[PDB]
Design an enzyme around this catalytic site. Structure first.
Site, short mmCIF file in Angstrom:
data_model
loop_
_atom_site.label_atom_id
_atom_site.label_comp_id
_atom_site.label_asym_id
_atom_site.label_seq_id
_atom_site.Cartn_x
_atom_site.Cartn_y
_atom_site.Cartn_z
N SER A 42 -25.34 14.47 1.84
CA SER A 42 -26.89 14.76 2.56
C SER A 42 -27.17 13.49 3.11
O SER A 42 -26.62 13.03 3.92
CB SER A 42 -27.72 15.10 1.00
OG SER A 42 -29.04 15.68 1.60
N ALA A 43 -28.37 12.84 2.78
CA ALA A 43 -28.97 11.95 3.53
C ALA A 43 -28.26 10.73 3.22
O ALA A 43 -28.08 9.75 4.18
CB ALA A 43 -30.50 11.48 3.01
N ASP A 83 -21.99 17.73 3.52
CA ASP A 83 -23.37 18.41 3.97
C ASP A 83 -24.21 17.58 4.32
O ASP A 83 -25.30 17.36 4.07
CB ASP A 83 -23.74 18.98 2.43
CG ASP A 83 -24.15 20.50 2.66
OD1 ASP A 83 -23.00 21.25 3.17
OD2 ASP A 83 -24.94 20.98 2.04
N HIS A 85 -25.33 23.18 -1.56
CA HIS A 85 -25.81 21.67 -1.31
C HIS A 85 -25.53 20.91 -2.46
O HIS A 85 -24.96 19.91 -2.21
CB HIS A 85 -27.31 21.83 -0.77
CG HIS A 85 -27.51 20.50 -0.20
ND1 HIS A 85 -27.13 19.83 1.03
CD2 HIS A 85 -28.60 19.39 -0.77
CE1 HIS A 85 -27.65 18.51 1.22
NE2 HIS A 85 -28.32 18.34 0.08
#
Ligand code: CA
Ligand code: CA
Ligand code: CA
Length: 269
Positions: free
Chosen positions: A128-129, A155, A245
């Protein structure tokens, strides 16, 4: 709980998450910062050992529940496959200052990678981030003559391709509370705000590094076509794993471990 934590949950329920994140970033400006040349340092966490020459260095995420523990499952699945270490994002724990820029954090983390690895090769990974943080770290490392052998982006939703993340911000926030295995205290929430602002203003640079995009196999909500998927703007290879996610890297971490093993040499390239 705390006012900040209750507020975050209410931001999810009421559809005002972006507003709340902007507040948390604003508040973060009133905490102590480091700029990369003031003597701050950090250490890597040893997560698992394994055979071969190439260590998998996993960067913690930027969610208020993020940290090296986010990789316990992945590291368990890689034990005896490759060595695994984790990089913390500074400012999520007591006593730690926040970075005043992407360059500041990347510099202190690159110091630590180089001190720990020497000339032993490595790949950098994040989710993610945390995948944006990983790529920024890989970039820093390359700009210091210790490039990674590659980067694993799990992701990732980069700047300009975040439409599904935006559509799902309420759902994401509710899920973070359902999966709160590390409590969201005020240090973590203000660090969320700071890193969300840093990563949102940053833009990745082309590096030529081998890159593996690992995608969730399903969306967190209904979508009309496949435009909900993670993406990356530079040359990369792509694999998908079961889960969404969140579950892809926890419940289905073993699937991720299998692709990493193949990409490090265990397929037929
Ligand atoms: Ca300074
Ligand atoms: Ca605290
Ligand atoms: Ca292998």
């Amino acid at each position: 709980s705390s006012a900040l934590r209750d507020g975050y949950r209410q931001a999810g329920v009421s559809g005002r998450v972006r507003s709340y994140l902007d507040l948390l970033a604003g508040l973060s400006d009133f905490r102590e910062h480091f700029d990369g040349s003031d003597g701050f340092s950090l250490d890597l966490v040893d997560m698992a050992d394994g055979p071969g020459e190439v260590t998998v260095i996993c960067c913690a995420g930027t969610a208020a529940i993020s940290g090296p523990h986010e990789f316990t499952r992945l590291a368990g699945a890689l034990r005896g496959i490759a060595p695994v270490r984790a990089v913390p994002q500074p400012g999520y724990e007591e006593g730690e200052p926040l970075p005043s820029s992407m360059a500041a954090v990347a510099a202190v983390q690159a110091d630590a990678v180089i001190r720990t690895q020497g000339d032993k090769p490595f790949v950098v990974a994040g989710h993610s981030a945390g995948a944006l943080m990983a790529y920024a770290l890989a970039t820093e490392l390359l700009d210091r003559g210790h490039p990674p052998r590659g980067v694993v982006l799990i992701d990732v939703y980069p700047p300009g391709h975040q439409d599904a993340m935006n559509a799902w911000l309420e759902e994401l926030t509710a899920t973070l509370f359902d999966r709160e295995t590390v409590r969201m205290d005020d240090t973590r929430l203000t660090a969320l705000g700071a890193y969300d602002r840093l990563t949102g203003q940053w833009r990745p640079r082309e590096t030529g590094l081998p890159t593996l995009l690992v995608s969730a196999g399903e969306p967190m909500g209904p979508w009309p076509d496949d435009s909900w998927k993670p993406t990356w703007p530079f040359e990369h290879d792509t694999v998908a794993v079961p889960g969404d996610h969140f579950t892809m890297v926890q419940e289905h971490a073993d699937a991720i471990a299998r692709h990493i093993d193949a990409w490090l040499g265990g397929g037929n390239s």
